[PDB]
């Protein structure tokens, strides 16, 4: 396509990304090739787009390439690496070489790039009888110092090294340091730049998009690296990060196609907040009734009756939490097999504006869809735009299921009629 | 091309545009069609890219469409419009309709849009025996209030109306109000969104790019509208604005192809700052000598002699200002017709870092080019990167004109050799 | 009176008003006459006095004056107006004419006047079988943007128009948009500038001052306009606004006599926070005792006994909330019919400094007054200034009821004696 | 001595140092021993005292210790080092090792330590036929970014590496990078932490304190390292830095004894601003007269006469600049060989408050001292505290030289008499 079409397409993701914080965990193999200049460039552009950037790199592969050419051999414990005085010192050397190169790359094709003692570490200790030695884990992150640099527009660069109040240095594991930092910052996005195109399903298909549950249930039969990825990405979400992404940092332009297209190129994982939605049974009716009543009084919801609810309780769903009731929604069906209607959508006012509404709408569409309904109607006197913004188009009475067209004519409410199509 | 290629291409213009101020003078016919939704959209995106926006619209065409359907007829004096109480009142109505529509357009496909009493006007008075009445000209612009809103990230919307301390309103001419506002703000860019694709040359070719001089000399045989455009665009430059652009605000996506491509779609006008560059004659030598001397002393410039300068004065150019001498540069030629060399490039240290250097380099390339030289060498001990950043590639001794290869070998300076190709 | 006396009288209301936020809902008939220049002037002065101003106007009457001269006729549903595409467009025109005129008025006899997309609207929908069409209600107010402009000292101007994320405009009802905005801002004062001198009582007397209850109970027999006024003013209070005022915006200088005199010219409505105050019965004594005890221990409250409380429980009042007890206060009476004494005033320390103290004092004066007491004494060892600041003057022992003069002499406490007069 | 005496002595240097900027150029041998923990500690304390710190280290000695153990050998050109791709890469490694260790040292016995791309470099080029290769010199310092970090209280750490807009890295020479940075910042103090105790005189005595002139004239017979030190320290002063210090960064606590004692431990160099002070001859009298006159008129300066000036012109000194006259001061002598008096001290009012006054006082004391005067009197009606703050004690008439005691008695001015002692 044309430039204007590309830019206009990017446009809504530029709006989303702006003034947002992105933690990038970068595999340290990317900090070497022509993959570096490409990456530095793309990172400069993300700066220019008003994305707050915290970049973390790893050092493990560099550490093995040395451990294999020096005679010595690497030891790993749950995926963490035993690091001694020696590998520690080399990891300090690498940090410096890679910071200086990333800066020349960035500067060379000025963007403000900053680096600081933000992390205090502490040794992992001993895992499973094995002393990890100088392997560390972040103990404290100066979250205020970091925000401070990010407020000023600076890009933050972190090596995988932290210090302790004993004057020692420890080698952090990047995959879990990035997820720790993202959580502290409450970064909207954690991005893992790997050498592989996302996370594959059981039959070799790339998982475009996963819940934290589906990510979880993939790891059971996944390689160990991708299980550590998944584990960190899940804890990041759990700790508040809104979205983690896995990309191939080696594939040219990937970061940009990730962030700024509907499509993308790796894997994106998000967590579902909890919402018990179930079939109403008849113990809910007083609960439903008291929710629904003042809305009927207000002219918002169709005059009902309790005996209706009792004989139609099977078409209701309720949303709850700690056994209290925060939402309801009904599915009506018609002589026409292809039609349904969502009716009686209602969220407790104190619990409004958190997405309960939506969650109930979604659940009614899944219900509709499982019985072969492809057209969902909503008739609303006072609430149509809510459905208009959520996929519903305007319709006519002459468009209703025939008996609904009747009720509508005789109810006198003159509500606005709207439909959504639902796909197989 | 691909998305990534488009975005990577935009990238350096996103860097230029960012935190920069753009005044847009918008023809009020654009505020009506599907040209409005397209424009509002593109303007929202420029916001999202961190461009400070001041938008001004005109009302003249709306005013005539009324003046032609109401019976009355428009009168114009130098291109300014006589506006009475009545047309004044309609122009107030239009402002409101067009502000409200631009806001619905913008909001509807939230970006912060602000509008204020920034302008105090005063009547133009009487031109050429003709009373302009309620035609106004900006008398004072609250430049601090404006910056203030722009600092906060707000987009500024202005109607073509200002008030006076007598409690009257006047109808501003948009083309010149925008240029006045841009000048007050010292906006880096003034953009005129018109219904025509830029400014045409004598044979119907679009003028991609003009100096303020070339714009000027076009207007002699130009239509009156485009002469008023040109006149305002010239005064804007003169008053400090760095770049004015003329586009077709009706052609879909034009603003975006303007700002964010090497190419573009309308006309871009810029002003040449003054620089007397001429052939040295022999009254300059003491001037050149005293400039050049301490650089030779420092090992920066080739050991010279005065008798050299006297017998080679014809290959020197000097840069001056108020009769003082701020730069010099030489062109050497060789047995090879295709070769030249820039030597003895030198700017007075007090006058450095304003582009004098560059201006002398440019002038030497134009000189070289007019005698059929296509390869310009520079040999520099201490200054090569200056030429490297300005189009010069690295070369070998074996690449020099043969006699230059000799001198080089026997001078012992071991300088870095660099060439630039020059096109016909 | 003299200038100095007027200014010195204004003075304490200038102190109250300063740095405070006032939302003004302005009837759009005022935006036309010589009532405009007068109003603009007075509003400029309120600016100069450091009052944060948000001004909203209505458009309904303008809309009818058109709907009556164009042939068409207005329809109203609960007092809201059905507005179509056409009246919508005229309402956009009016906004522009009236904003521009208010600005010329203000500027013309410079004060910073700002206007923005602060309001997102949504259609009211269908009321009572009737489609309101383009009638809107505020869905979201950019409360941060507003504060931001108000922080900088800007006066905010709002038309009665909001947009939706569908790119549509809707006509807001001013009386309820102003009350919505005031609530969002938590404005200390909402002011309705009407064409009538406040709100009349059942016999044509102007209600100077009303509780939200008394406003409420007036509306039962009130005209429909004044019932909508009252309804919005009540919800504004309920939602947190401290004071709503109704004035005649057409009566010259009214706003200034409202704000800055003890008197005023329209109607001022305020809401009573809740305080269950009742007669103690004997189930309170352990509650009273435990409150009062540590104060006796501290020398603050007269040594008592439980058998006293039991035989005098009828002279106590208690203040409660959720059945817990937060205050007590006693009324003593004397051989002298004209005398009372407030004794044993005590507020739970955790519940102090919210006006409970005062509420109990007030309730004791109402009690005293209903039995024909015109002189209330308070004898306080440690707390006299509290009574001194609340209407109590210093007195002598020789001033006490005779038997109180006795007890006082023999109790030895040497407390400070103070009286307040109470009127019929 | 006691703690309290030490702290009270430090006290006035803590006041001087506070909110002041200190650039420390650190020899990279200090970044290794137990000299590191000692230094990190002392630097943490300077932070805690509110000193803004920019720290720069060198890498040359590390580079030779490698160049001597790897086979290769170092080349130096004017003291700058030829650095190739290889040594460049090692210098990147060293930076990282030394930054990480300095941070563990500092953290380990949390103070905010920051590091950034503040420096853009460019190759030195070719010196004296010799290509320096990857040897760099700072081209641009982001002085705003630096101040920004320093404003926030952060300590700035710089390696001796900068980048260019070509994406290359270059090895800066620390001694001259520190002096460049200090000048950009206008740091009050540049401190060189070396392995030697300051700068020695011709006979092995440590130069406690030097003018930039005396530093200069030492370098003629100084070792080459100390000549480069001296040269950078002089240009730093010349460029605006107020004080440069040379210490032994290896001698325990030296930095603290430098900054915070009257004494110190290395060498401190400062520059004398220019002041032509000379003997008045008789071409000055109209100049002196016009200066002195309005002060006599004001009662500030003793009534004089021109014929006095003409016959006493030899006891006057004048201060000038571009041949204009900005100060005068006289030395009187007496029958008592041990006494002098400064009289007629006067600075042009436009040129006041820049230290001219002082410079003239100093010059008169040097004059006095060279003729064997050990007691300088000043008699001032209106100006005594100026002399009181500058070493003069209060005295009596009975203390004056006998004939001065006479004049004083008969002049009637009743001025305040003050003396200063002057040492051999
Ligand atoms: C066919 C039918 O069922 S018609 C009956 C529909 N039910 C009602 O009208 C009952 C009263 N209103 C409610 O209960 C509203 O909560 C609901 C049901 C419409 C939405 O429930 P919520 O839990 O608030 O849903 P959710 O959080 O996903 O949506 C919230 C958003 O809906 C928007 N919304 C809510 N009311 C309306 C409305 N009447 N018009 C337009 N938008 C609205 C809210 O402003 C909020 O906006 P935002 O995303 O910019 O914050
Ligand atoms: C072939 C030959 O003629 S070799 C002899 C070249 N002459 C010299 O070296 C003389 C001493 N230096 C000068 O006179 C420098 O001014 C010149 C001639 C190189 C440039 O002149 P200016 O008027 O400063 O030119 P202009 O303003 O267009 O260029 C300024 C930019 O050049 C950069 N520049 C200047 N010196 C150098 C250098 N030695 N190395 C790299 N960049 C440099 C400046 O830092 C400035 O950077 P910026 O754009 O990021 O601010
Ligand atoms: C005659 C008699 O009853 S004497 C016995 C009076 N009772 C006591 O002294 C009991 C201990 N103190 C209390 O219980 C105090 O709460 C009371 C009863 C005096 C006031 O009750 P509150 O609920 O705090 O009353 P309210 O909120 O209306 O008054 C609060 C104000 O009273 C002021 N106030 C409270 N104590 C005193 C005092 N001893 N002296 C002066 N002012 C005081 C508070 O500082 C507060 O000041 P503000 O308006 O500048 O914030
Ligand atoms: C013995 C005799 O010669 S008596 C005659 C002395 N001459 C006068 O009184 C002439 C009028 N005043 C002057 O000419 C003043 O400039 C002088 C001569 C006293 C000082 O000259 P300057 O160039 O200002 O000297 P310098 O800059 O070193 O001293 C400036 C400081 O002196 C202080 N100072 C100046 N006047 C006085 C005074 N009358 N009393 C106390 N302090 C003073 C200034 O406030 C300034 O204060 P700072 O250091 O806190 O800024």
Short mmCIF file of C-alpha atoms in Angstrom, two decimals, chain A residues 1-4 6-11 14-15 18 38-39 41-42 44-45 47-51 106 109-111 153 252-254 256-257 260-261, chain B residues 1-4 6-11 14-15 18 38-39 41-42 44-45 47-51 106 109-111 153 252-254 256-257 260-261:
data_model
loop_
_atom_site.label_atom_id
_atom_site.label_comp_id
_atom_site.label_asym_id
_atom_site.label_seq_id
_atom_site.Cartn_x
_atom_site.Cartn_y
_atom_site.Cartn_z
CA UNK A 1 0.00 0.00 0.00
CA UNK A 2 0.60 3.74 -0.11
CA UNK A 3 2.47 5.78 2.49
CA UNK A 4 -0.68 7.69 3.52
CA UNK A 6 0.27 2.98 6.17
CA UNK A 7 0.61 6.10 8.26
CA UNK A 8 -3.16 6.37 8.69
CA UNK A 9 -3.21 2.80 9.81
CA UNK A 10 -0.37 3.25 12.31
CA UNK A 11 -2.22 6.27 13.55
CA UNK A 14 0.57 5.79 17.76
CA UNK A 15 -2.23 7.24 19.87
CA UNK A 18 2.05 7.63 23.37
CA UNK A 38 18.22 -1.96 12.70
CA UNK A 39 17.13 -2.20 16.40
CA UNK A 41 17.08 2.79 14.66
CA UNK A 42 13.63 1.37 15.52
CA UNK A 44 15.11 5.78 18.29
CA UNK A 45 11.79 6.04 16.41
CA UNK A 47 11.45 7.42 21.39
CA UNK A 48 10.41 10.01 18.77
CA UNK A 49 6.85 8.74 19.09
CA UNK A 50 6.73 9.57 22.77
CA UNK A 51 7.10 6.02 24.14
CA UNK A 106 21.58 4.95 18.08
CA UNK A 109 21.74 6.95 12.15
CA UNK A 110 21.02 11.87 20.06
CA UNK A 111 17.96 10.67 21.39
CA UNK A 153 12.06 11.92 27.90
CA UNK A 252 13.92 -6.67 10.23
CA UNK A 253 11.35 -4.12 11.36
CA UNK A 254 9.46 -6.60 13.57
CA UNK A 256 7.38 -1.69 14.27
CA UNK A 257 5.01 -4.20 12.74
CA UNK A 260 1.76 -0.24 14.90
CA UNK A 261 -0.32 -2.70 12.85
CA UNK B 1 6.20 -0.39 -0.42
CA UNK B 2 5.94 -2.15 2.91
CA UNK B 3 4.70 -0.62 6.16
CA UNK B 4 8.13 -0.89 7.83
CA UNK B 6 7.16 3.71 4.99
CA UNK B 7 7.44 4.15 8.73
CA UNK B 8 11.25 4.04 8.58
CA UNK B 9 11.13 6.68 5.92
CA UNK B 10 8.76 8.94 7.86
CA UNK B 11 11.05 8.47 10.80
CA UNK B 14 8.91 12.66 12.68
CA UNK B 15 12.12 13.59 14.47
CA UNK B 18 8.49 16.90 17.02
CA UNK B 38 -9.95 13.43 6.30
CA UNK B 39 -8.34 16.71 7.57
CA UNK B 41 -8.09 12.86 11.19
CA UNK B 42 -4.69 13.95 9.78
CA UNK B 44 -5.31 14.49 15.14
CA UNK B 45 -2.31 12.40 14.02
CA UNK B 47 -1.08 16.13 17.41
CA UNK B 48 -0.21 12.53 18.37
CA UNK B 49 3.21 13.06 16.84
CA UNK B 50 3.97 15.92 19.19
CA UNK B 51 3.49 18.79 16.73
CA UNK B 106 -11.78 15.30 15.31
CA UNK B 109 -12.66 9.16 14.46
CA UNK B 110 -10.28 13.81 22.21
CA UNK B 111 -7.18 15.25 21.28
CA UNK B 153 -0.25 19.85 24.37
CA UNK B 252 -6.55 13.02 0.38
CA UNK B 253 -3.61 12.60 2.74
CA UNK B 254 -1.64 15.52 1.25
CA UNK B 256 0.98 13.67 5.58
CA UNK B 257 2.84 13.26 2.31
CA UNK B 260 6.73 13.03 6.27
CA UNK B 261 8.23 12.17 2.87
#
